[PDB]
Every structure is written in structure tokens, then in C-alpha cells.
């Protein structure tokens, strides 16, 4: 069993980035495959053993992240990503900090050549391609808890940014389809969890409470880095901090530095008013049994230093008063010839104040890129003449300080990322820190992403031309509409239906001719996109349960579509022949066409009529009358008002053919929709006023007026106590 | 390639002014931690500005850097009448060391916009520049946002340096 | 368990796409068929191996892809994903060793296949092969050993694995 430990140490030496020159890429590929096939056999059982899990947690992920960062060879990256995907799949539960760092960084490089991005997309698709459940699981592990940065929402936003063909300029063609597969699988899977749960039954668990608490944290941090004074009081009002005491403020600031902006802490902390906050925050750090350079490193790794000098003087004066009392004093064991002894140095608070300023002096003078005149060791050693109770310092001591600063900087790693030499400290910083219920997680998952995905899909639906991809897009959009309708998300659902109604190409030459033919009819028939758009747009209409979701412009698009369909003599107006039979009246007067030819004049040639016949068959198969009006739910006062508003009051030259016909058609609809309407006390006055004002339009032939009078008596029968309108009719 | 120090009390004004000076072209990533170290160009001159804190113990550490240095700058706020007593102590303290015979001294009376800003002559009277001799000094007024005659101050520095060298 | 399957198909598919610039259709069929399910116990194990069989059996393809496929089969029998609990495992192993005996597709792939034959026949699952398949196995390793044109080190590989399968065969007279 120790041999396993030694073996994984050897593979650490193989894979690690320090041993780059002394190994070939073939050997690194082999080592990658070795740990990859070793993980698969006893994957979860590595959790129990602590030392091996530590070996697989901190250093080997440093190796895997270094390799995916600065690799150009394709076979090497092909081997590298495999181990990472398997480790996410098996051991993703425990070491999730490294997974979050890897996903944020890989998505950062992803959204900046083409072949490396293609391989990265194809390999990272492993995670969602196992099953849809992982895409939910990452929500309830990464984004739910406040400690860790957001992953899943950034995952969807980046992925749907990549799914556009617009990335084809900056990426090869193999990326868009495999990118789209993940979103298609997600939306298809979300339809599966719909049938069991009733719509009205669903409408919170402790897990989502963290998500509710998290959203104010981002705004609080934005306000805090905007300016310091406005941040803390709202935060304390929210109650994240225990109280307004400086002890609790320090308790916040020491623990969760990663959430906050370092420059904000650097600016706030040096304020001359909050010296008590300085003292309280300084106590939290530990310096026991460490050298001075490690003490300043521990000081400055947690927060950025402020630029201007007197603030550094204040901060190091705050440091010294606590660091002097932190270390126990033993004057007996003072010595000079001793080497590598921490206890030999016991400096007075002013002495260590001067020394602490001295390492900052060294770093700024030597390693600042601007300063041309580097420092020298001899003059630096002489600079501290008599600064420990008026005495000199050990030679080996200051020699080690100079060597340490020469070998490595003093600077926080998070801002200065991307450099080859700097990933060691950046990686080491992080690890020092360490059926009804299922649906409830997904509301927020839609609430941040719902527009963007739809927009991306519609962009593809505008750009694509193949039949298979278009119909796959259409059915996925139908399932997305189902998800929006069931989840009671209104504006989103309105967005899908409005974009569909714009895409169907029926909502705005050659006049009408006998099988009618028209510009709209030929445009419908010849185009496959709108042909398939209409059938989904009226399949979604049938299944709607709650009619409250529809907006005003959606209803306007519906009446525009049904009117324009009826304009060209496509749809027969007998939506409600039962109403006619009960009222015992004949069918409507169909609108006349311009010319009627039975079977150089512009006869529609035989090559033009087939589009009209195809449109005829499609609209007949759509079953429009049974769709919009046949279902009981869609009948609402909004439909009545929008439909009866959309009648054509004036008679221009062009619209002479269908004026009286459409005028009768609108009211013939509104009688049936009034009759199935449950309440009639309020809307009755509206329909009566509009119909009677519409009856006073001039120029109508006597046939339609005889037809129009028949509706009025039935209206007055149905509606209540409108004596003035009945008197007007009688008079 | 010359060095100039700068001394003051209000960090925000000094930092904003220092960011205001350096614009010939800005192509950089991030500065190192510690003291502000900035560059400023001018026709036939280039200068580097460091920062300095004022107190007895650490000013010994600043001594050797004065071997190549020849200039000094200040920033003094307008409506900060309370803390002039703290400022003028530092001003007198900087004169204490006797190796600074070739130390060019300036002032940038930042925020000369508010109505209570003391006059430049009254700024001289309060700072106490009359009762000293045997060195070169200059005083000037500038604004953080609008700006006023800062380039004239740099021209004065350049002309003084060419008079010296 | 199912992750490793479509992992291997992802690897071989991207290798095929890189090398090319009839098998990919069934390969994507395998991908889509194995995407949905959770565990292999529902379905038979002949079809999951069948695209690998089709690539390794025919000789029109160069050594890179067939080497990758043979390494895939090595991973398959090393991880023991095709367990005896899975349906029709006897038929899957029989088809594997039937197709593998045709040494057609420079010398790396020969050692890969003969190592695979060693790992199959030595394992207990190799007891389920039929007499015709194992006779054909012995025929092809004999053809490998007899040759002089081939590299001698490959000949010693054939010599050792022939000794092994002979021991396994002649242990059965009890």
C-alpha cells in the first residue's frame, strides 16, 4: 500500500510542469494515460485514503491545469483532457474547488487557434453528454453555496455564445453542432419531467434559500468596490456579519477575501479613521514560528497593499505592534554564530517596523520594471546600520532575505495570472482555504438564461437552411415553450411566440385569382421555413391551459394572422356553423377575388399554382379553426377586445373586395366567443358600443345590413339592461 | 532618467495627480506593489517619480537614494485648514537633512476650485516660505480634474535642471 | 461504466476525422444509442463492440486507426466492463476473437493483437470460446512465429504467447 503512494509520487514527477525539459511529450502522454486508467479501477475508494486523495487534489491538478494552459501539441492535449473529464465524472463531489477553477479558466480561454478550441469543445462535451442530470447537479454544488463563484450560469451563457455560426469565423465548423447538442439535450430532458406534476399544483426547500441569499451578495460587492462607505451598512442590515463591531468585520474580511475586490480592501483599510479596524484585523493573522518574509507574505497575500507611502507606514506600524507580542521573547538564547535559527532574532517593535519596511524597499527597488538602477547587497546591508537597539543585524539573516526576494517577488497572484512562472503561488493560495423537489432547482436555471438561449436558437433558425436541423430546432423550441408555459414565465413565452410570428412570414404584387393564389400564398407555399413554422405555431396554441400568459401584442399578432389568412380565401369563415344552425342562418358571404378564371394576360402559369396547392394542404392540416377557437381555454376578454378592435372601419380603394365580408366575419366570430364567455356583465357594453358604431359605417349593401340587424337582437338578448341601444335600434 | 520624490498627506489626490501626469501612451498590465513609481515625458526630458513617507525612523532608509536625486514635489489641499499644522512639520523636517543642497522643491495646491480655498499668497504665508534662504524653491497651483499650469511647473523643473547641469 | 464506452468512441471518431482529411454512421449510432441509458444491463453487448469489430476486421484502413481500436479493446478487457452479468457476453467475446485472428490492416498492431489474444485466452472468459475460433487463433500465432521477414522481437512475442496459450489449452485435460 505504501507502494501506491510512491507510484503516485513518481507519476506526479512525470506529469508535473517542473520536469518539462527532462521528459518528452510521449512520456507525458503515457503518464497521463497511466493515471487515467488507474483512476477508473478504484476511483471512489480513493476518497477514503487521505494521503492519496491529497496527492490527487492539490499537486496533480496543478499539473493538469499547467498542461492544458501552455500546451500546443494536439495529441498531448487530447491525452490531458481525458483524465480531467474522468476526474470530474467520478471524483467531482469532493475536490470541487479545483473543478470550479478549471471550468472558469478553460471557459475564459475558450471565449477569446481553431483546432485547439475544437478539441477542447469535443472533450469538455463529455460532462453533459453522460446524462442531463449532471447539468442540474452542478447547480446544487457550485452555484447554490455562497462560498464559491458562479459556474453553471456562466456555463450556459458561454456555451450559447459559442453555439452561434458567428463563431465560424473564429472557430472551425465542428464546434457549433456538438455545442448545440448539449442545449438540445437539456431542453429535451426538461420536457420529460413535466407529465407527472400538475400545472396548478406547482406554484421552498432549504437548498434554494442559499441561492436567494447569494444574489444580494453580488450587488453588495459591486456597491462596496464602487465606494467603501456604502457597502458595510447595507451588508450589516442584510445580516451576513454578526454585528457592527470591528471584531465581526475582521472576522468577515479574513475568511472570505476571494469574494471581495483586493483593491477595495487596500483603499478602505488604510483610512486614518478606522485605526481600531486596523488593530482588530491585524490580530487575526498568525506569525508564530515563521521568518519575517513569510510574515509579510502572509500579510500581503490576503489583500493588496496601497500605493502611497504614508499608508504603507500606517499598515506596517499596525503590523509591528502585534507581531512583536505574537512571538515569545527569550533574551537568554540570543546568538550570532548560529544559523537557520528563528529564535535568534528577537527584534524590538521599532526594529521590526524598520525591517518590515526594508523588505518592501528591496522588492520595490529591485523588481519594479520601471527602475533601471537595481539595488546591491552590500549597500542594502549597510542601510540598516544600527536598527535593533542600536546594533547591526546578522549577515546570514539579511543575506537570506535578499536571496528570497531575488528568487521570488512579493505580489498577489490573482491579478498577475497567465505568466508561465507564476502559477505556483496562484495554485497554492486556493487550497489553503480548505419529482416535485427536483423541479424547484430549475426556475433560477431558466431565469438567468431563458432569453439568451432562445435568441441563439432563433439566430440559427434564421441562418440554417437544412430541413433536419430546422425541424429539430422547431420541436426543441416547442418543448421550450412548454417549459415556459408550465413554469409561469410570461415575458419569455411571449418572446418565443412573437419571434415565431415574425418568422412565419404572414404578418406584413399580384391580385387574387382562382384554389386562391396570392403573394402571401405563394410566399407561404414556396418557403419551407414558414411552412413548418405555422404548424408549430398553431400546435402550441391548442395545448395552452392558462390563457393569462398571453400579452397584448401576442393577441394582436394572432388576429393579424387569422385575418391575413382569411384575406386570400384560404380559410373558410365557418368557424362556428353550430351558431348559424342554432340561429338558423345561411353561411357567410365569401370575399370576392379580383379575377376568376375557370379551368399578354397574367394568368398564373401552371408552374406557379403548385405553391398555392401546397399551402392549401398545409393550412388544412393545421386545423386553424379547431386550434385557436375550438379549445375552450383561449376564449378570454382580451381576445374579444383585440379581435373586435382589429376590424377595418374605413374602406379604401384597395380593400373593396373583402370589406363587408370581413365586417360580417369579425362579428360572427365575436358572437360565439361571447357565448362561450362565462362573465358578460362588463364586456357586453364594450362589444355593443363597437358593433353599433361599426354598423353606422356608410356604403354597405343592403344584404349585409339585413345580416347585421340579426346580431343586434341576439346581443340585446344576451347582454343586460341596455335600453338606450335597443331604443336606437327600434328607432 | 532622473529621480524626483513627492510628499503629502491625502492619498487620493496624490494618486489621481500621478495618474494624470503619465500619458504619453499607456500600454501596460499592472504595477508592482509598494510605492508608486511613475514616468513622465517632456520634450527632450524624461523623469521618474518615487514616493516618500515622512517620519524620523524611516527617513534614514531614504538617504542613499538621495545621492542621485535632485528634486522634490508636494501636494497640499485647499479646504484642509485643520491639518496644515501636521503638514508644515513634515515640510520643516524635510529641510533638516543637510545633504540636500541640490534639492529642487515644488508645490501643487490641488483642488483650487472650492470657494474657501486659501490664496496662493496666503498659502505661502501659512506654509512659511519667506524666512528661509540658500536654496531654490517654487510654488504653483493646480487642479485635479480641470488642470492648471502643471506643464509650466515641469518646464520650470527642466529649466532649473538645465541651469544646474 | 458507460462513460468509458462513449469516451472510447469519442477518441476513435476524432482520430478518424483527423486522419480522413461508412463506419462513422454506425459509430454515431452507437454514440446516440449509449447516450440515453444508465447501465449496460438493459441491452446486449455485441452491438456496442460491433463498430470496433467492423474497423478492426477489414483491411482498407491504415495502422493508426486500427492501433487505436486495438488499444480500445485492450482497455475494454483490462477494465472488465464486458462482464459476465452483461447479456450475450459469450457472443461478444466469440466475435472479438473471430475477427481478431485476421491479421490484416506497421509491426505495432501485430503485438497489440497478440497481447490481446493472450489477455483473452489466459482469462477465464477465454474458456467460453469455441473450438473453431481457438484453432484459428493458434493458426494465426503459428503464422506469426513461422515468419522470418518480420522482426525477431515480434517473433519472441509470438513464441512466449504461444507457450502461454498452449499451457492454457493443455490444462483442460482434467
Numbering used by the authors:
A (entry chain C): 329 to 440, 455 to 545, 550 to 780, 799 to 872, 888 to 893, 903 to 987, 1004 to 1135
B (entry chain D): 17 to 181
C (entry chain A): 11 to 31, 71 to 154, 162 to 230
Task: Provide passages from the article that reported this PDB entry.
The budding yeast homologs of GBF1, named Gea1 and Gea2, localize to early and medial Golgi compartments where Arf1 activation orchestrates the formation of COPI vesicles destined for the ER and earlier Golgi compartments. Here we present cryoelectron microscopy (cryoEM) structures of full-length Gea2, the yeast paralog of the human Arf-GEF GBF1, that reveal the organization of these regulatory domains and explain how Gea2 binds to the Golgi membrane surface.
To further investigate the role of the regulatory domains in modulating the action of the GEF domain, we trapped the Gea2-Arf1 nucleotide-free activation intermediate and determined its structure by cryoEM. The conformation of nucleotide-free Arf1 in our full-length Gea2-Arf1 complex structure was nearly identical to that of nucleotide-free Arf1 when bound to the isolated Gea2 GEF domain determined previously by X-ray crystallography. Strikingly, a closed conformation of the GEF domain was not observed in the Gea2-Arf1 complex cryoEM data; instead the position of the Arf1-bound GEF domain was similar to that of the open conformation observed in the absence of Arf1. We note that structural predictions of Gea2, its yeast paralog Gea1, and its human homolog GBF1 each adopt the closed conformation. When bound to Gea2 in its nucleotide-free state, Arf1 is positioned such that its N terminus is oriented toward the membrane surface, and we predict it to be in close proximity to the lipid headgroups. Although not present in the construct we used to determine the structure of the complex, the N terminus of Arf1 folds into a membrane-inserting amphipathic helix upon GTP binding. The conformation of Gea2 when bound to the nucleotide-free intermediate therefore appears to prime Arf1 for membrane insertion: GTP binding to the nucleotide-free intermediate induces formation of the N-terminal Arf1 amphipathic helix in a position optimal for its insertion into the cytoplasmic leaflet of the Golgi membrane.
